[model samples]
Target: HWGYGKHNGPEHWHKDFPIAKGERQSPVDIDTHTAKYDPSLKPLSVSYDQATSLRILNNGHAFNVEFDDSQDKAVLKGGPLDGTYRLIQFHFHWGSLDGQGSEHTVDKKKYAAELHLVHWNTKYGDFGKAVQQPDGLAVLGIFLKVGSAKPGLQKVVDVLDSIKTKGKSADFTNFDPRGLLPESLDYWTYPGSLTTPPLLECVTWIVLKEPISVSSEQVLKFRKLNFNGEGEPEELMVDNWRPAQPLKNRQIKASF
Candidate 1:
């Protein structure tokens, strides 16, 4: 199984998942100077009703907060998208320490963490079907910097204790993801793949320019999560992030 451990980490993934080195792979370094300004890009529009939140789970790779995507109750539109994309889930990537956790970077500068809101195009019918198309998935990446505590992040932090080990889950509801958004919606977007194994090239990456503040204490809470099962040898889940890949011939566009 693929994991973030020394023997099975990102560097070894390409052996089994050859697409890991494919063009348009995600978490590419975003050079702000070279990203072209696309005036035609529309401001991102996101709507999430509290009812859309379903539950939170620890899948060994990362902790994800799943959503009810049976309908368009929560969705993302505009900003390099042609139609609505239903919100399926959101997850995070973090380092064992605060200095480097984010999968994507700005001018090679990494953040303490990164949040990925995963969505699939409605045109594809469902997430499973969408993952095969080039225009299928659209992920919103937000950087998390260490600073003041974020009330919005508290809702998620409060549930960390309930799902400390892999395969554990807890009901997570009435949580509006809108509260997680930063003041500005400015972003840099491009065609990319899933940052993990299976590395499908079906994502339209929309990474926010501004990072949201999260306290150091809050970040520590995340490290308490274990990648191993309840009865397995203890292994703290950290540095669960892929390093930035090559840019290739792809062009990243800015919405600013």
Candidate 2:
């Protein structure tokens, strides 16, 4: 019994999932044509210390990455990004079936999947307080495509066999996420909300235009993740992504 079957899709998600009605739903399409012009589109400078504090967790559906503030190098300046926007957690959205796993859609075409790198501004202190603020969070969107195998992602995938069961997690030591970032830092920026529960409208989104590739087998392994807990029959976790939403008079911007 898949949650997305027939009438059980988005319309029924709210009743089934704990965090579906969140105001800030993600996987919104980035229309470059309607994007606003912002001269400043470069990535904020971050230190190596901040980079090292990244923690990895396997949340069954996808990987969840959390960062420690003590290790962060980039300080949050006041304004839209004011407050201590510490990297908190990150996750992914995929499909239950193949060829239709991405959260965002462009011209009705969906990618293999979408990855969200979530962050919270420390101006309010904890993650709970920050969620209430209009500008208290940021998320980076990375699109995954099906193509030739990529060795860069193997570090995390190699350990999948150990944490394939739901709610099961293993320590991922000495892993560098910077290597997973797409070669082109070029991205589309916009003001939006979180894709998960309590969908707050305070997110600064950076959606990378370039996509990374993975193999079919790797994708199949991803589908084997079960949400029903360990020891239970494995359920396909593919197509967990959300569909793109209307811009609603909002303007998105792109950086070369």
Candidate 3:
């Protein structure tokens, strides 16, 4: 029953899951002051096939767009990676209020929302097992700024009302997430873990520096999602972001 509530929030997660206090915890503060510029970093290689998009589900945590990872139809490579990483699913994190929802913060600056495109090493074969290996997963993070309604975001918004309840789901396909990426691929990289419970430290985080803008109205729609199922007292699925964790000794490499 862990969640973003006062009683079950991040602060008390370590009680049930010790990994919550792991050294390489995610949702870190990206301090450019000490970040090293790595010229050796490669440009991100991203490719997504529309047909691979499977379905969208309100999993009580976030709305996730699942993908067909049985094949290499959609994959990620090149950027801070040793081998090819296949796209598995994509989801988002936001808040009930503006300016305080995103997970990763840059120099203490929090964005309106954050998009996470979860991928896994193709060789390991599946996200489930790959998520446990040290070198198995890669997650791309895109910060979302508040602006006017973005035409590109309409596709996602159109389906929001149907998934307002926690356990609801619907068909969601033919959407290429690659097209929603920001223009600049410049990024910051570091080793981190999944923000949620059972927080495995298997992710190679690739956080983009340039943020993409989303309409203010779109953010409100994202808040419409509930944290509990239909019968439970309604809890808006907002502020679903983990606080930035300690850097410990990890270095954030910059690919400019």
Candidate 4:
């Protein structure tokens, strides 16, 4: 399997997953200068009920919070998406340090971290069935900046302590996803793939134009995590972001 480490890193991903070099890949740079504003692009509509949040897990790759998508409990529509996509899970990618952790860049500038809210089109039935199709998934990206403490994020960070080791998980209910978003609903959208293998070209990426703030001190809490389970060789869970990918022939649409 591919990882962010030297031998099994992104460069070698194409070996096992030929699609890694495929036309549609993720973590692309978003240059506002190159993006064409589309007035017709609809504003993104996000509806998340706190009750839909189920649990959180440290799955070695990253800390992920799973949501109950069984029904249309939480959905993201509009803003470059067709129909509605049900929110299944949310996670983050970050650098070991403050200046470089985000997967997508704004005008080639990196941010403190990046949050991904993974959702799948109900048309495909479920996440597993839709993961390989062209428009099966939509991953909403929100850039995280190091600034004054984010009271909203404190709830999420507080639970990180219990799931420090890999494979650990805990109940995470009544948590609202709305609190994590910035004021602006504007975003840049395009076709892309997951940052990891099978590196499926299934995502319709919606990257927010505005970034949310989190204190530098709070950002450091991510470094306190471990990449493996008990007794495994200790590896700090930091610098977990995938670098930018090629844009190919795809257009980066701006919903202003």
Q: Please, what are the lDDT tens digits per residue for candidate 1 over residues 160-245? A: 98999999999998888887889999999999999998999999999999999999999999999999999999999899999999
TM-scores of the candidates in the order shown: 0.98, 0.82, 0.97, 0.97
lDDT of 4 at 101: 93
Q: In candidate 3, what are the lDDT values of residues 107-144, reduced to their tens digit?
A: 99999899999999887878888987988899999999
Model 1: how far residue 104 lies from native, Å? 0.5
Candidate 2 TM-score, true structure as reference:
0.82
Which scores higher on lDDT, 1 or 4?
Answer: 1
Q: Report lDDT per candidate.
A: 0.93, 0.64, 0.89, 0.89
lDDT of 3 at 37: 94
Candidate 2 off by > 4 Å? 1-9, 14-24, 40-50, 53-56, 70-84, 96-98
- TM-score, structure 1 vs. true: 0.98
Report per-prediction Cα RMSD to one decimal: 0.8, 3.5, 1.1, 1.2
Candidate 1's displacement at residue 58, Å, is 0.2
Native RMSD of candidate 3 (Å): 1.1
